[PDB]
Design a protein around this ligand. Structure first.
Ligand SMILES: [Mg+2]
Ligand SMILES: [Zn+2]
Ligand SMILES: [Zn+2]
Ligand SMILES: [Zn+2]
Ligand SMILES: [Zn+2]
Lengths: 198, 184, 76, 80, 64, 228, 105, 393, 48, 75, 433
């Protein structure tokens, strides 16, 4: 999900409506975004959108927040104050799980949010120890579409070497991609023919 | 009933286009006008409202902004009466209470944590070169600052050219010697 | 080139028994721990040979089979 | 595609008052508009439409979530 | 293809007589020229080429 | 306790008792902090980044002083008083003077700090404790963006011969015409200021793409050189 | 330029021997006297404002995009004046629609 | 191949309309400063190419551009009519009559039309200004023609070809003629010896003719851009001509410089014009860091919503139809033209258990269940028989 | 001279850049060629 | 980060691979950077600001104290 | 025309949200996609008939009753119209309208048939100059289908109302502007292209500064012949002309000047510098470099390097550049063969060199004047009097979408898939009878 200021975020928590923090007057959020996402990215448009959306929701209005329109953060906050809320958008919230109130008044408001179309169910993949194999090199086919594979590339081999791993390298490469036994005459140095059954 | 009329007339015009009825083009034009009117009236049903934050002083869209304004300043806000740039490095502190007898403390940034505590508040800064308060810059005379700055710049250029050369040395604080050298 | 014989077949490889998915935070896991969805754990398998010391422990995995977690579907 | 049956955030059933609210809002916009085409209503610089009293008369409390999702949710019948 | 002009007519150096010429050279010339004994120029030209195994050319495209 | 902090408590825990105990202590201290915030709360608000009117006038005064010394450089240029040192042309010396004269002084933190309650300001606490952000971020958000520099120089006049944008005249000598953004992010950039900021941001994006692409070949060549 | 009188073609210099004779491809030779005896030169003065910007400096007072400053024109006493800054030396030239050129150009 | 084409992925209405408004360089460029330089925001982009919209990832950064909100692409103009008009102009000396010696010695300027050199004028500026006035009148010179006057070499260029980027700019008019006459009268007063010669001067006034009643009419539909061009209130400016303009970036700047005789703007802009359609979606974008605005230009086109109004009739691979969409409580001009995609979720900017660290989001399970960001995701499987040998069954 | 049959069909494609004759075989400075990253995980390279 | 990153995970199945993983490739071995010889892990963002809040002397309410119940809640 | 005085217009009460109304007016006039549909309609209305009729005239001669030596095939199309897409329902149907959703679902291509009619002249030239002409008026036939952009005047939805589109399966609100091809939707983007009839001078960063001038004779659809002027490290200035006729051939500039006349080099230098008698440093450097370039030898054009005969140079170039001349000595004896080659070369150059100035013989001097102006500009840039053209600025860039791109691909595709099979079939038929 992402707000209209360009703050992407992967949804990782499913909190029932009782576990969600709530304000003094019963308002709880749909999304809880970390405050640390702001200062490095300087996405102040999202915060101003929230501080205007609170007053807009209370007044039952819709406002134009087009770029380069005149804006006064002080006047928007005073609009919040005249709407009955605090000068800042901050409110008294209670922890949903334990019922205790937070010491710090929490900034909560309606921020427009977009669900970007990169779904987990499309992108997740897990393949067992067998499937379609490439005819030429005897290796698994490429990608989820071909129904097998996923690549342990050059840099993964470099990293496993840097750890002195091997064994795991033997497993993943040989025993899991195209492991085979190669017979060599040892008297002439050329590949030979061996068959235990026949 | 109007939507019923529009729907059935649109289907009839679709059939007429498919069978190539003779006067299809002008009928399509007038039905396009009617559909335009009906689409406008359906667009009215789609409006959710729109509110403009009005300026109380001027009953129009709020044009008050906190944007930067240029506001040219006097030159004494950058230099002293001797033409040297201000170095706002000495911080002046005042005691909020009337009984804390030290009252005024002037400190350097490093010594602040050693010397100043919560019983104090910060006033305007102090220049460490000309000993003028930050909020007392306006006390300086503009003419003297300007003439000192121009004279110092002329001296700077003259010294820069003649670092080794002869008409026919890094600080310039000696004074009244540079005048007789420059006029020479 | 990258997709040639050497750099795509020898230096790299396509491997079986591997999974990929989006990562997300979890403050309840130790740093040395990773959260693994149960569906993946049912897809991926761990080879445990049956010996005298582990047959007791490995029996529940066998009898759970395809139906319950932790189960198993392969025997050599 | 329609105003939700309940407010997404909290679950208060704004869907009861939805169908009444669409028509009431249309009627109120009719009076508050002027010499302005419908497609230019979200462009008027001298136009202010507050639905606070209307929603309050609908019985919906002073909740940010419910009023937001009531006044903002798009209707598919209006665009298609 | 190789040619040869001897202040005159340019005869074509076909692989056959090229094999003949390379077969004329002896091991001492190759060794004294720094090439390995296994680097004799007679090996450069082939009459019986090697067809690669089907493992490297599957199909039911280079097989064409 | 911060990550990548040399000599921090987890480094000493690893040195004395082992990296596994360091990871265990990292998790334990993280849970302590997270629960204390669960009961203490923490947030950032739009009013955390909003200056008081007196502080806004002070920010305006500081930026006016910057522009005043820039205009003094321009006035020296007008009368032909810009005499570059040897090995430098008048254009380069003048650009150097403007670049070194349009720098935010340390004093710019006085109005920012006067608007900010450190005990409660979420943005200031996040910046100060090293959790996220830096003083430049706070200054950009609250006071002003300042000079926009690409390759350690102002916006070169690419629009035409002697023009940076259609919004500024040819041979414009004021500082804003060459990339100096006076407005802060919270105050809202004007159109040319946003154009210059977008130039800088696009340059950053291009630089990051180049970083990835070039470190590719560099790393591969180094690895193959050293791998044996 | 030396052109052949008969056929109007370019005539090479042919610096031989004590004098210079310009020889065409049709054989015509026209000799050389004093002013023909320069071969090549490259003067060192990083200045083209006199000819590179002559058209631009003339047109500048009519250019609406040029910067103006609040100064009086000595010739016509308009209170505004267009300001040009030229070259690496950042030469400032003040011009006006009346032809005033401020001692430069 | 000179056919810049891309598949039409209907991620939403905004993505489709931005696909139809995309300008592709479609070059090659090896390791050079060229690759960096051609991806930067050039100073000629403002108003014609979106200064914000671009790809934020990979090699596509700055490669794919977007037209600004008001920018348009011209069609081929009537070159023959303008050529005949110019040739009959007494101030254009046709090539048949002027030799190159007369070109240089008389200081004659060179006149072009669509790059074809025909004619020479005594004064390039006068000819360019007069034909700009005629274009403003709108009859003899089409309003979509470019009249560029290269002051560096005194060459007037008329361009009527296809593909010129154009955008309408409101025209700024001033009293510079009366100001000059008042200055001359004051000068004569000084010469005569008047003590209060300041009395004869007049204040400089520059303004635009766009009155608020014009805005009310445009809202009412009784006034169009065709009428504004016809009345001379605005005009179309091309980058070639844009290099001959001095544009006040907003009516606020023009009002501030209303009496400034040192900044005589040729035109006045609307600052929202410099941004594309997708970059206008971001609210208070001038308050956000511009790089984040570019990220928004990408994400708003990736955003799930009503991807196609006729979705049931279609069979599209990997398309997501988000059931509920909301007009933002803080909307922008972009939402007049495209359907918003998303919801006005209540967002609490707070720390809750640390599960939202490193830009993760804690989502209410009830908001998920009630329908928030839900929808239908579609896939298609199509298979054709190789020949009559095959059969379904 | 009026024949259009034997025209160079590649001439109809009007050149769109300057140095379409300028040829140097060098790595594209944006090409992810020596970094071995799969197509779907190229989203890891996305900044934020 | 969690802005959409995708990461690979394979579970070793051979006995040698498991031994090697848990004895040599365990992440405890990478706590101290091989690059700069310092630690790589620690408290980031949330936990850093949380430790600052927890360890400071005074809150806006006065002394930064908690009763026994909330001290137990921390652990 | 005089407007109201600017001292009276009341602008104080005008807000930014009012200026948003002007933004809306601009968008409404534009249509926000309008250029796509307008350009495609312009294509089908002007360009396709224009290209087919004007540009694709065929005049070739082939050699295979023993007195007959060659057959001259000449034909030209004067009829071309693109009607809306059709589908044949049950094979034996009358063909019926193909609505876009039907194409999308069945994988059909939203292509409307192209109907063509031509006039053909088959003229056979015998030995000793006997000539016979066979002529036929060929009725309007149709073997072609041109993809139709959705929403264009040849799209079926153009005469359907919004509700009619709703029930058909189109988005009533979507404008169109894309192509349906093999079950997909494709958008022909606006190609970013350098400006035609504009000299682009960027440094060769054995070459030095290079200028490229792409000349388009007429409207949007005329084929453009690019001329590349190079200043080389050898001191020479060479001109390479690329077109349908020429390719990769590098020619000294003075040769190009003198095969149109004025073989005198003083007039050539005058055409470049615009005044030989003029003083000043620019003329002096110009003269120096031009003289050096004139006197420098050339690997290829040495035989005509010092030739003052225009005809000999024209014949030399016609030998070098024209195909079908494999032994340039047999035709030399026949004066009529030389006349044919010279006249063909002069017509080719009149059509190819700087066509935007003209395409006739009377414009050759003015073409040379413009070429001299181009060389003057290039050598001005080499002075550092001018900077190189900004390769990324939009002062010299164009966006060509749908109509222009489709026409530029269509001329090549139409040639290859229509003119070549037709010529081959006529040659085979003349073989058979
Ligand atoms: Mg990431
Ligand atoms: Zn053997
Ligand atoms: Zn609610
Ligand atoms: Zn001669
Ligand atoms: Zn004057």
């Amino acid at each position: 999900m992402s707000s209209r200021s360009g703050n992407k975020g992967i949804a990782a928590l499913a909190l029932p409506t009782s576990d969600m923090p709530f304000t003094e007057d019963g308002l709880q959020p749909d999304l809880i975004v970390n405050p640390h996402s702001h200062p490095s990215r300087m996405t102040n448009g999202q915060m101003i959108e929230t501080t205007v959306g609170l007053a807009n929701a209370l007044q039952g209005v819709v406002t134009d927040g087009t770029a380069f329109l005149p804006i006064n953060v002080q006047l928007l906050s005073e609009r919040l104050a005249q709407e009955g809320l605090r000068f800042n958008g901050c409110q008294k919230m209670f922890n949903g799980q334990t019922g205790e109130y937070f010491d710090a008044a929490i900034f909560i408001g309606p921020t427009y949010h977009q669900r970007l179309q990169k779904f987990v169910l499309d992108d997740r993949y897990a393949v067992a120890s067998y499937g379609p194999t490439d005819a030429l090199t005897g290796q698994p086919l490429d990608g989820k579409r071909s129904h097998g594979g996923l690549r342990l590339g050059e840099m993964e081999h470099w990293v496993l070497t840097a750890q002195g791993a091997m064994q795991t390298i033997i497993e993943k490469s040989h025993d899991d991609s195209d492991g085979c036994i190669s017979y060599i005459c040892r008297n002439c140095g050329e590949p030979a023919i061996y068959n235990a059954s026949h | 009933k109007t939507s019923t009329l529009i729907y059935l007339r649109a289907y009839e015009l679709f059939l007429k286009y498919l069978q190539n009825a003779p006067n299809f083009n002008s009928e399509l034009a007038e039905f396009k006008t009617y559909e335009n009117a009906y689409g406008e009236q359906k667009a009215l049903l789609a409006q959710q409202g729109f509110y403009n934050i009005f300026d109380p002083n001027t009953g129009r869209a709020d044009q008050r902004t906190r944007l930067f304004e240029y506001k040219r300043l006097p030159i004494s806000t950058l230099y002293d009466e001797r033409g040297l740039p201000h170095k706002w490095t000495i911080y002046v502190y005042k005691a909020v209470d009337s009984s804390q007898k030290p009252a005024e403390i002037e400190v350097t940034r490093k010594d602040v944590i050693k010397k100043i505590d919560n019983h104090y508040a910060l006033a305007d800064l102090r220049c460490s070169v000309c000993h003028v308060l930050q909020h007392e810059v306006g006390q300086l005379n503009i003419k003297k600052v300007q003439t000192a700055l121009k004279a110092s710049l002329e001296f700077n250029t003259f010294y820069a050219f003649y670092e080794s050369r002869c008409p026919k040395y890094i600080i310039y604080d000696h004074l009244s010697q540079p005048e007789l050298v420059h006029d020479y | 080139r990258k997709e040639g014989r050497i750099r795509k077949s020898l230096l790299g490889s396509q491997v079986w028994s591997i999974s990929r998915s989006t990562i997300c935070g979890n403050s309840d896991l130790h740093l040395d721990e990773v959260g693994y969805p149960i569906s993946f754990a049912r897809t991926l398998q761990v080879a445990e040979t049956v010996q005298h010391y582990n047959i007791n422990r490995l029996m529940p995995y066998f009898l759970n089979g395809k139906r319950q977690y932790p189960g198993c579907s392969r025997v050599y | 595609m329609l105003i939700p049956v309940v407010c997404f955030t909290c679950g208060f059933p704004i869907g009861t008052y939805a169908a009444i609210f669409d028509k009431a809002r249309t009627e109120y916009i009719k009076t508050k508009m002027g010499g302005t085409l419908p497609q230019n209503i979200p462009l008027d610089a001298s136009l202010q439409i507050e639905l606070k009293d209307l929603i309050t008369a609908l019985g919906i409390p002073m909740r940010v979530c419910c009023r937001t999702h009531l006044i903002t949710t798009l209707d598919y019948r209006k665009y298609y | 293809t190789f040619w040869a002009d001897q202040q005159g007519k340019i005869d074509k150096l076909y692989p056959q007589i090229i094999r003949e010429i390379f077969s004329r050279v002896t091991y001492d010339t190759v060794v004294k020229l720094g090439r390995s004994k296994n680097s004799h120029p007679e090996k450069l030209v082939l009459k019986a080429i090697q067809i690669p195994p089907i493992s490297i050319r599957p199909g039911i495209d280079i097989n064409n | 306790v911060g990550a990548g902090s040399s000599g921090g408590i987890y480094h000493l825990i690893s040195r004395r008792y082992g990296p596994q105990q360091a990871l265990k202590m990292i998790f334990a201290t993280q849970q302590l902090a997270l629960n204390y915030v669960r009961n203490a709360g923490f947030t950032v608000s739009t009013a955390d980044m909003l200056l008081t009117p007196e502080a806004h006038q002070e920010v305006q005064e500081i930026i006016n002083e910057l522009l005043l010394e820039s205009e003094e450089i321009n006035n020296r240029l007008l009368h032909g008083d810009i005499m570059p040192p040897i090995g430098l042309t008048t254009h380069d010396f003048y650009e150097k003077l403007q670049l070194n004269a349009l720098k935010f002084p340390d004093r710019i933190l006085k109005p920012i700090m006067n608007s900010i309650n450190p005990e409660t300001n979420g943005l200031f606490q996040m910046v100060a404790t090293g959790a996220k952000g830096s003083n430049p971020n706070m200054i950009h958000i609250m006071a002003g963006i300042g000079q926009i520099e690409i390759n350690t120089q102002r916006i070169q006049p690419q629009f035409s011969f002697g023009r940076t944008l259609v919004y500024y005249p040819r041979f414009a000598l004021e500082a804003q015409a060459y990339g100096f953004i006076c407005n802060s992010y919270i105050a809202g950039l004007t159109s040319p200021e946003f154009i210059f900021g977008e130039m800088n941001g696009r340059f950053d994006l291009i630089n990051k793409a180049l970083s990835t692409s070039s470190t590719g070949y560099a790393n591969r060549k180094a690895i193959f050189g050293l791998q044996s | 330029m030396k052109i052949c009188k008969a056929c109007s073609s370019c005539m090479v210099r042919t610096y031989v021997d004590g004098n210079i004779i310009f020889r065409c491809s049709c054989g015509e030779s026209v000799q050389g006297d004093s002013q023909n005896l320069l071969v090549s030169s490259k003067v060192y003065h990083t200045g083209e404002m006199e000819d590179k910007y002559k058209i631009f400096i003339k047109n500048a007072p009519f250019d609406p995009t040029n910067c103006q400053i609040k100064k009086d024109c000595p010739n016509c006493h308009l209170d505004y004046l267009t300001q040009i800054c030229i070259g690496s030396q950042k030469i400032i030239i003040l011009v006006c629609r009346c032809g005033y050129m401020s001692n430069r150009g | 191949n000179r056919v810049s084409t891309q598949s039409l992925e209907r991620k939403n209405l905004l993505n489709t309309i931005s696909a139809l408004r995309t300008v592709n360089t479609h070059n090659a460029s090896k390791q050079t400063e060229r690759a960096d330089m051609m991806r930067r925001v050039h100073a000629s982009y403002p108003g014609y190419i979106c200064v914000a919209q671009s790809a934020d990832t990979g090699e596509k950064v700055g490669m794919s551009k977007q037209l600004a909100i008001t920018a348009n692409v011209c069609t081929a103009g009537e070159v023959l009519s303008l050529k005949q008009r110019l040739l009959s102009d007494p101030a254009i000396q046709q090539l048949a009559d002027v030799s190159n010696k007369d070109i240089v010695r008389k200081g004659l300027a060179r006149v072009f039309i669509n790059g074809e050199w025909i004619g020479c004028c005594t004064n390039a500026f006068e000819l360019a200004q007069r034909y700009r006035m005629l274009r403003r009148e709108g009859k003899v010179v089409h309003p979509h023609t470019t009249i560029y006057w290269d002051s560096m070499v005194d060459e007037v260029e008329f361009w009527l070809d296809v593909g010129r980027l154009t955008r309408p700019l409101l025209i700024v008019d001033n009293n510079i003629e009366k100001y000059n006459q008042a200055c001359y009268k004051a000068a004569e007063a000084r010469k005569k010896g008047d003590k209060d010669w300041e009395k004869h001067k007049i204040p400089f006034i520059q303004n635009t003719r766009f009155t608020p009643q014009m805005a009310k009419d445009i809202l009412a539909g009784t006034l169009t851009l065709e009428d504004l061009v016809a009345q001379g209130i605005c005009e179309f400016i091309t980058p070639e001509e844009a290099e001959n303009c001095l544009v006040a970036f907003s009516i606020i700047e023009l009002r501030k410089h209303k009496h400034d005789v040192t900044r005589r703007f040729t035109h006045v802009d609307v600052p929202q014009a410099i941004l594309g359609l997708a970059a206008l979606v971001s609210p208070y974008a001038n308050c956000t860091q511009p790089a984040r605005v570019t990220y928004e230009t990408n994400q708003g086109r990736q955003t799930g919503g009503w991807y196609c109004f006729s979705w049931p009739y279609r069979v599209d691979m990997n398309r997501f139809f988000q059931f509920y969409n909301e007009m933002p409580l803080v909307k922008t001009i972009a939402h007049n033209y495209v359907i918003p995609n998303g919801l006005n979720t209540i967002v609490a900017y707070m720390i809750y258990g640390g599960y939202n660290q490193e830009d993760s989001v804690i989502v209410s399970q009830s908001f998920i269940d009630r329908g928030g960001f839900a929808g239908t995701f579609y896939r298609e499987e199509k298979v054709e028989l190789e020949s009559d040998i095959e059969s379904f069954g | 001279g009026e024949d259009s049959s034997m025209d160079d069909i590649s001439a109809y494609s009007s050149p769109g850049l300057f140095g379409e004759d300028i040829i140097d075989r060098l790595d594209d400075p944006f090409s992810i060629e020596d970094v071995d990253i799969s197509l779907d995980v190229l989203d890891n390279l996305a900044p934020q | 980060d969690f802005d959409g990153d995708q990461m690979n995970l394979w579970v070793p199945w051979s006995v040698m691979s498991r031994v090697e993983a848990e004895l040599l490739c365990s992440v405890r071995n990478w706590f101290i950077s091989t690059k700069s010889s310092g630690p790589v892990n620690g408290q980031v963002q949330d936990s850093t600001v949380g430790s600052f809040l927890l360890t400071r002397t005074n809150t806006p309410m006065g002394k930064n104290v908690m009763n026994k119940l909330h001290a137990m809640g921390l652990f | 025309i005089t407007y109201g005085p600017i001292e009276t217009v009341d602008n104080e009460e005008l807000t930014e949200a009012d200026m948003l109304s002007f933004i809306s007016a601009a968008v409404n006039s534009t249509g926000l996609i309008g250029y796509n549909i307008k350009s495609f309609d312009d294509l089908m209305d002007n360009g396709i008939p224009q290209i087919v009729k004007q540009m694709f005239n065929v005049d070739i001669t082939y050699k295979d009753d023993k007195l007959r030596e060659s057959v001259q095939i000449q034909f030209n199309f004067t009829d071309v119209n693109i009607e809306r897409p059709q589908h044949r329902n049950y094979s034996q149907g009358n063909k019926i309208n193909l609505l876009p959703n039907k194409a999308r679902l069945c994988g059909l291509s939203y292509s409307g048939p192209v109907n063509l009619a031509a006039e053909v002249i088959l003229t056979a030239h015998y030995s000793n100059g006997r000539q016979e002409v066979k002529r036929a008026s060929i009725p309007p036939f149709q073997v072609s289908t041109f993809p139709i952009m959705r929403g264009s005047n040849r799209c079926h939805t153009h005469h359907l109302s919004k509700t009619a589109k709703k029930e058909i399966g189109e988005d009533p609100n979507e404008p169109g502007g894309y192509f349906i091809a093999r079950g997909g939707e494709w958008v022909v983007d606006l190609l970013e292209n350098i400006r035609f009839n504009t000299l682009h001078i960027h440094y060769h960063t054995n070459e030095i500064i290079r200028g490229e001038f792409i000349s388009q004779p007429g409207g949007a659809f005329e084929n453009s012949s690019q001329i590349i002027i190079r200043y080389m490290t050898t001191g020479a200035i060479t001109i390479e002309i690329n077109s349908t006729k020429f390719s990769k051939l590098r020619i000294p500039w003075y040769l190009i000047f003198r095969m149109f006349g004025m073989t005198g080099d003083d007039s050539i230098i005058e055409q470049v510098v615009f005044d030989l008698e003029s003083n000043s440093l620019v003329n002096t450097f110009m003269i120096e470099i031009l003289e050096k370039s004139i006197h420098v030898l050339d690997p290829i054009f040495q035989p005509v390097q010092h030739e003052l005969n225009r005809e000999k140079i024209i014949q030399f170039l016609s030998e070098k550049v024209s195909k079908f001349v494999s032994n340039p000595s047999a035709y030399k004896s026949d004066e009529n063969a030389v006349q044919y080659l010279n006249e063909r070369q002069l017509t080719i150059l009149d059509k190819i060199l700087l066509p935007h100035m003209g395409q006739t013989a009377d414009t050759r001097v003015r073409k040379l004047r413009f070429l001299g102006l181009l060389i003057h500009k290039i050598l001005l840039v080499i002075m550092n009097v001018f900077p190189p053209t900004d390769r990324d600025s939009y002062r010299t860039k164009r966006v060509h979408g749908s109509g222009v791109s489709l026409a530029k691909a269509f001329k090549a595709i139409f040639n290859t898939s229509v003119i070549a099979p037709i010529i081959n079939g006529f040659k085979e038929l003349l073989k058979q009878t």
